[PDB]
Each structure stands twice: as C-alpha cells, then as structure tokens.
Design an enzyme around this catalytic site. Sequence first.
Site, short mmCIF file in Angstrom:
data_model
loop_
_atom_site.label_atom_id
_atom_site.label_comp_id
_atom_site.label_asym_id
_atom_site.label_seq_id
_atom_site.Cartn_x
_atom_site.Cartn_y
_atom_site.Cartn_z
CG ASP A 6 7.29 59.56 -3.93
OD1 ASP A 6 6.02 58.94 -3.35
OD2 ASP A 6 7.55 58.62 -3.48
CG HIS A 9 -1.27 56.73 -4.40
ND1 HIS A 9 -1.46 55.89 -4.14
CD2 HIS A 9 -0.46 57.40 -3.91
CE1 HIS A 9 -0.57 55.62 -2.58
NE2 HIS A 9 0.15 56.28 -2.71
C1 HEM Z 1 3.70 52.59 -7.74
C2 HEM Z 1 3.95 53.17 -5.95
C3 HEM Z 1 3.81 53.96 -5.67
C4 HEM Z 1 3.82 55.49 -6.11
C5 HEM Z 1 3.97 55.38 -7.35
C6 HEM Z 1 3.18 56.54 -5.14
C7 HEM Z 1 3.41 57.86 -5.28
C8 HEM Z 1 2.88 58.36 -4.62
C9 HEM Z 1 2.76 60.67 -5.05
C10 HEM Z 1 2.88 60.89 -5.72
C11 HEM Z 1 2.07 60.42 -3.57
C12 HEM Z 1 1.96 62.21 -3.66
C13 HEM Z 1 2.75 63.43 -3.25
C14 HEM Z 1 3.12 63.09 -1.62
O1 HEM Z 1 2.27 63.59 -0.75
O2 HEM Z 1 4.12 62.09 -1.57
C15 HEM Z 1 2.01 59.81 -3.14
C16 HEM Z 1 1.78 60.28 -1.30
C17 HEM Z 1 1.56 58.69 -0.66
N1 HEM Z 1 1.73 57.65 -0.74
FE1 HEM Z 1 2.15 56.58 -1.99
N2 HEM Z 1 2.67 55.55 -3.99
C18 HEM Z 1 3.07 54.79 -4.58
C19 HEM Z 1 2.86 53.25 -3.02
C20 HEM Z 1 1.84 53.44 -2.10
C21 HEM Z 1 1.95 52.53 -0.85
C22 HEM Z 1 2.46 50.83 -0.88
C23 HEM Z 1 1.93 52.76 -0.15
C24 HEM Z 1 1.63 52.77 1.74
C25 HEM Z 1 1.46 51.83 1.54
C26 HEM Z 1 2.05 54.92 -0.30
C27 HEM Z 1 1.24 55.93 0.73
C28 HEM Z 1 1.15 57.41 0.22
C29 HEM Z 1 1.16 58.46 1.70
C30 HEM Z 1 0.59 57.83 3.07
C31 HEM Z 1 1.32 59.34 0.66
C32 HEM Z 1 1.00 60.59 1.36
C33 HEM Z 1 -0.46 60.80 1.06
C34 HEM Z 1 -1.26 62.54 1.78
O3 HEM Z 1 -1.45 62.42 3.07
O4 HEM Z 1 -1.46 63.25 0.82
N3 HEM Z 1 2.25 54.54 -1.19
N4 HEM Z 1 2.32 58.11 -3.36
#
Ligand code: HEM
Length: 301
Positions: A144, A216
């Site tokens: 993350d 996601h």
């Molecule tokens: C259980 C809840 C969540 C988990 C486990 C989670 C997990 C992850 C993971 C594994 C990544 C990929 C690695 C990264 O680039 O950081 C990611 C990316 C991201 N997450 Fe989440 N996330 C969650 C919730 C959310 C929520 C609620 C939002 C926004 C409202 C969000 C927004 C984002 C964004 C903007 C990225 C980067 C996407 C990109 O540009 O590649 N996430 N998250």
Amino acid sequence: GMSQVQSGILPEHCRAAIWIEANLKGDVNALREASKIFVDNVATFQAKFPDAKLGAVVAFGNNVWRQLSGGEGADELKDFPVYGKGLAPSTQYDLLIHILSARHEVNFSVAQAALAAFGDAIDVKEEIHGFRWVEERDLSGFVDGTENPAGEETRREVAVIKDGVDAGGSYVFVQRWEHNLKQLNRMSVPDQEMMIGRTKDANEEIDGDERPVTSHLSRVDLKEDGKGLKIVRQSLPYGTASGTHGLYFCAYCARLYNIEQQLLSMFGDTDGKRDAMLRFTKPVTGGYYFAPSLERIQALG
Ligand code: HEM
Ligand SMILES: [Mg+2]
C-alpha cells in the site's frame, strides 16, 4: 504574510499513527482555545522528541467549521454522504485529530495531550492505532503506497490549498475498513491480483486493458483529459490478530472533488460497477473534515 501547513499532512513513511474522531458536546467556543493549546503541545513534543519526526492535524466537520469560520471559505466542505446508496456507511463527526511519527509511544503522549486540551467538550467516537506492517503491505499482503505522491513538492501540490483565505489548508477523508482475511485466503493469488490490479509478491502494475474494470486500480486511478485526480494517502493497517482488523483509510487533498470522484467510482455511482475489494473487506465509518492552516488555528478566538 503567508500560510503554514499543519505538521501532520506532508510526513512520508511514518511507522505509526493515532486517529481520534469525536463529536462536540457543548458550545463550539470550547474548540477555539482547545485547538490552540493542542498545536502548542505538538510544538512542545516536537522540541522534546526531534528524532520522532512528529506531525499532527486538527480538522473539523462541516457544521462546526461553518460556525468557526463564519461561513467563509471551505466551499466544497459538506457532511460525508452515503455512497452506493449504503455500500459506504456515513459516520460524520465534528472533530478529527490525526497524529503520526516514527514512535508510537510519542503519539500516545500526544493523544493524551489532545484529550486533556479538549476535555469534556468532546465525545470520543473512535480511537484507532495505526501501524506500518512488513514491507509497507496492507494486511491483505499487497503493498500500500507505491503510486502515492512522493516528495514534499508534489505532496504540497496535491494536498495543500494554494491561495485565498484557506491557503495552507486541506480537505481530509477518513474511512475505517474491516478485512475478512478468511474470505481473502479462499481466493487464489491470481484472482486477488485481478481484484487489486497489481501483482502480490513483486507489486507490478497489471495493464489497464488486461485487468477487470472492477479492479481497485481501475476504480481509483482516474484521469480528466489526461490529468490524474491525485490524493495524499496516510492510511495504515490496524487491529488485533484474533479480533477486528483491516485498514484505516486516510487521505488529504487540496480539492475534496478528487476524493469524491474516486468514491463515486468505487461504490457504483458512476458506472454501476463496484470495487472488487468488497469481496473481502468493507467500510464501517466515513467522514469529511477541513484541516485549516496553522495560523488560522491561532486566529481562532
Ligand atoms: C481496504 C481499503 C483499501 C485498500 C486495501 C487499498 C489498497 C490499495 C493498494 C494495494 C494500492 C496499490 C499500491 C499503490 O499505488 O498505493 C492502492 C492504491 C490506491 N488507492 Fe487504495 N485501498 C483502499 C482504499 C482506498 C480508498 C477508499 C481510496 C480512495 C477513495 C483509495 C485510493 C487509492 C489510490 C488513488 C491509489 C493509487 C492508484 C494509482 O494511481 O495507481 N483506496 N490501494
Ligand atoms: Mg497510474
């Protein structure tokens, strides 16, 4: 003649954090002096523990911020609505306190100082102790933070308001997720990778035309005419091994719009499709807050 950001927005790679969410029990005037005392305490703790790299943020819900500001600025601020007609719960409170550092013991002392400053003027609804897990992975086993904005310059561009009365301020979104790791472990590693949009072990992005639209990354990597809707995430794992556990989601943005577009996408409001992570984890809280600049906390009185 300029604005200073609150210390807890921009720190990268902090190993621990404390989030306190609370409701106002009496007259809103109690928040003015309490907020001044707390930012004073944060400066004292930074001087006492320089190697903690301590930061903190005090942010306010719509109703209390409209009263404290007199209706000026924070044009996008509103109570957190329900998304997906229920899929994302709303638990809008009045006050958010976010503390982060390299030392959990220092965060605990700062949390106690926050509680002493506000005292019986607030009703604590939630207190979550975040911790960075092995290889900065979410409890699901996926890294993350990879595409999160890197460096002070880009983080300021994404999270901090540039000019006008709110110059130095930011919008905050908090949402606590409860993971069902038993349900995740029933999925094969390739099916979990298609759910996230990145490989599990190596943390390689799966191409946008190779992964499902419900993945996601396909839900939250949004662009408007090629321009990414970026946010500064400060989320961390939390909980006990045998009890409730998951991810305490926290994000800062100069525009509340960027966060809302991602939620509309994740919870089915934009195209009727929802985030594949809902197969193993669910959000149980939700709130929007406005984090004013440091000197606007000083001009509360
Ligand atoms: C259980 C809840 C969540 C988990 C486990 C989670 C997990 C992850 C993971 C594994 C990544 C990929 C690695 C990264 O680039 O950081 C990611 C990316 C991201 N997450 Fe989440 N996330 C969650 C919730 C959310 C929520 C609620 C939002 C926004 C409202 C969000 C927004 C984002 C964004 C903007 C990225 C980067 C996407 C990109 O540009 O590649 N996430 N998250
Ligand atoms: Mg991308």
